C-alpha cells in the first residue's frame, strides 16, 4: 500500500523520533489510528506527511499534534 501519513510517539512535543508509517489515507483516519497505536500514558503524538520528515526519517515538521488527554491541534 501507499503511505500518506506518518506519526511518532515521544515524551514531549520538542523530542523527535523516526517516523512510523500509518495505514490511514485521510487525516481523520490518521488521527484515529495514531491515537490507537499510542502505547503509553503521558506521551505526545505527532502526525506528518512525507514532507514532514528530514533526510534521516525524523518527524520534525508535523502537520498536527496531540498532547495526552487533549484534542489534536493542527498547525493551521
Residue numbers in the entry: 2 to 77
Provide the authors' original text about this structure.
The evolutionary arms race between prokaryotes and phages gave rise to phage anti-CRISPR (Acr) proteins that act as a counter defence against CRISPR-Cas systems by inhibiting the effector complex. Here, we used a combination of bulk biochemical experiments, X-ray crystallography and single-molecule techniques to explore the inhibitory activity of AcrIF6 and AcrIF9 proteins against the type I-F CRISPR-Cas system from Aggregatibacter actinomycetemcomitans (Aa). The cryo-EM structures of Pa- and Pp-AcrIF9 bound to the Pa-Cascade complex indicate that two AcrIF9 molecules bind to the thumbs of Cas7f.4 and Cas7f.6 subunits and the two AcrIF9 binding sites are similar.
We solved the crystal structure of Aa1-AcrIF9 protein at 2.3 Å resolution. Aa1-AcrIF9 is composed of a five stranded, antiparallel β sheet cradling an α helix. We superimposed the structures and identified the Aa1-AcrIF9 surfaces potentially involved in the interactions with Cas7f subunits and DNA. The positively charged surface can be observed within the structure of the Aa1-AcrIF9 protein. Mutational analysis of this surface proved that it is the binding site for the non-specific DNA. The M1, M2, and M3 mutations disrupted the AcrIF9-mediated binding to non-specific DNA as the smeared DNA bands disappeared in EMSAs with target and non-target DNA. The M4 and M5 mutations of Aa1-AcrIF9 permitted the Cascade binding to the target sequence leading to unhindered R-loop formation and the Cas2/3-mediated cleavage. The deletion of the L3-4 loop (M6) or its replacement with the Pa-AcrIF9 loop (M7) completely blocked the Aa1-AcrIF9 interaction with the Cascade. This indicates that the L3-4 loop plays an important structural role within Aa1-AcrIF9 and most likely participates in interaction with the Cascade complex.
